[PDB]
């Protein structure tokens, strides 16, 4: 069982936790809670991995995707120590470490300004779990592989600017991140999302 | 016949605010509105008697059918257009046909209104997983709620409240037994949006 | 007990027409009907008292449970079978058990009926995005609508109207507070299907 | 104001049984319960007046908001916690705020109750395709049903019935006009779970 | 940004516009309106492409699919000129033309007659946005790559016969088209759908 | 048209038929009925295959998946003869036989015991059409290719033990099977599911 992804979030920002509070089909997150995202292979082995992590401590399970190529899942708990413990118990159980993860890589990233009404409606109707985007409101879009690392980009984005979380897809082969706001805030938050990706790209 | 067609709601909006415009475009089944467009909501009973009210409003104007839906018992629609005179003209014709006027409407009966300060984390994430088509709500954030009946009247309070303060539209359900309007933001910011919503319903009685 | 079991609807169809057969198979949760099959719709209250009515109809016949569902307040079912005598036999047994007969049913109260000629383009596409399980409607096309109560009675008008003219079944919702029946086609073709639907409900009073 | 807030349901469960615990976690929109956790269901009207009842229960205790939802007309919630005293403490505070007590609740009016032995194959598979969030039902299997009002009271009968016998929870819908509770198992096993459910509702009158 | 698909429809036939009026998660079509379908790569670049097209003229946005392999979208407007202008502004913005599109190709096509009741129900229940098919009613099925060109086949089909639009999948790597009616109308409409595909296959 | 999968079930066990009674978007199964699952290629050819099978006898159609890689479908009828006849009429129509099917192969299989509450909720909420799993309840998970053969494993599992059917995914490139119960019943049913797979692996 190899480690394809591994991303720890010190503290879920307000809008970040609120978003994953919507999508999560299990235990719900809260602002301040630590989070642990992990993809592995085979994907069916994520059931065994879910058992171990929950057996290790008081961590809770929020998400659990199970494909054949790989399986993802997220853990929540206010205390960073509790979540990090279960995380290191899973790796020490599958002969793996944090750096054995697959290095992230950006494939697309841009800032479209003054979005039109029509564009905003399709952004708001097609599988959106974030907030509403308005016309005249810029937007930052990002794609990454492995997909999990998009969460790291979203947490630093809000932590470093006043923008609006519109959507955060972290499940699958690739990921997606949509933000919005005045061009100033969106460009300062966009450069912060990519900077967060460059940190993992240097391990 | 055309006399048994009750007129639950009849609200007009001179100009759709940004948030309420993008929200309507998200939850509507008709043609999406463009921010600043005039609107004309209308609810009636029997539920599917809105088919004649729609046919008349469209035949008699250049307005687009922004919304049409037949609730369990009732049925509502919404007409959009940039020209105010165009929207209102549609309403004039439909009123002449069914034999009615503006003041023959079911006046807004506010069934609930309050403001909860510092919404707990649990309370917040719960509202987010509530078939939410608007924006998210956050913990520590103050919230304002306004239930009414008919449901189509909270559309007016949602608009004039947004004009008054830069709040966050969580959900504006104007179709159903009751119309529920939920906002959010900072305590002071929400107390201003709330007052604006009170007069919206109170200036119709 | 078995006496408090109201009998909202009790309609029988000698033979399911093509369009109404494929439509029922699309929206039903039971075994799909084959065109030409006999049907027996039954609505009751309390909502989930239909469990005993179903158990009896199946135990006492070779009929298949084509539909069973418990609406918010009410609950309906549908029995299918090629043999007419088989379907009717099920109904005979269930009536003996609950202590009732054919004429102890809630007679159809038509709450709305009309025909709109040349449906505008906006009005048409709107009806298409209305949780539509039937066929599409087109602009310029004429439409006929028939709301009633109980809802299970528009199933009879939908069938006999289809027999009368080659129209287009948009939606036949027989479950709910009200039963809504929507057709379409050419003006003259729809005026014939409409008349047939009027007598379907009027020959039950 | 706080006086117009009707108290439809007010049930407490000392300990959530296995099946009813995993089921609640499946259909709830809040924080999932852990088997053995105390619960406190509460329904009110107007529908979205549950926002103040929730805010108070959470502010005044360490309980998690297991559920919150605004039905068409009503609105319910559920508080979970391992400590019984913690859950009950939340209820004490909310009662003091709205000006009410335990015995000012809308007593359970059982609208339907029965037991169907040897459920036919058609009847079974039909219940399975009924927006089912619980376990499956099988043919030949005996079933027990219990509809009531308010709907939030079948949560008590579902728990004490599960304690009495090792049955199968099909569906426990506590939100809506009516509360429907469906079980299953062997004839004798179900007749014991049924009796336990009768006293659950009858010891509240 | 390469052009994978490009298909302009002179005038949406009655049943065609009615179908895309249902599926579209944005602005709705109308009989007579012109339509412009376009797939490109990367798929995330379709957001930038949506911005440009809507900025070019009074065209409206009806659909917008966004994958990683490629991104699709549809534009509507009564006037053919308005839609064609925005279309040529997008290509001149991404260094591309109409003929640089990927040539269509059929992988499957047949006419099954006298469909059975059971078959019709699964056709009507499994993700159908068209009209109902009846038993005793023939059926034409078609598959194409790129997927977008299936719209060109559907528009000519109804324009050349009296059949029934049952479904039209144009999003993804491949497309699908289901028709129905008396064998005569379905075979005359089927040969017209394939003929429309052969026109693009000769560019 | 090649045969990718072929699996005949003598008699749908109680919980098996009850499960496929939920998922099937067509005619519904019943305990005792025989079932016939078949995947082929191209997937669009499954429409032609559906027509033939239903034309051959009184068999009914319950499922019909139609991809491009391959198309699946299931047939139901109390009498084993009726279902087997239509099955052999389809193969004799596409120049194929039972043994020309693709041999099954296991990629994953384990028994996790004493599942935790959090794990059970995500198992119960994420696309489950079976029954509820409880905490303290073991679980058997299996994956197979071709996907169709998972049904053969589920039928023998219940037929050979007292467990709980939680989910049975048989559509797609691969399949999945989730069971639960006391470790004793789950391990005796797990060894029976794999044994059923080994029978087809020896043809």
Curated annotation (Swiss-Prot), chains A, E, F:
Keywords assigned by UniProt, alphabetized: Bacterial microcompartment, Carbon dioxide fixation, Carboxysome, Photosynthesis, Repeat
GO MF annotation, one: structural constituent of carboxysome shell
Keyword rRNA-binding attached: no
Localisation: Carboxysome
Domain of life (superkingdom): Bacteria
Residue span of motif Gates the pore: 67-68
Entry similarity comment: Belongs to the EutL/PduB family.
Annotated protein name in UniProt: Carboxysome shell protein CsoS1D
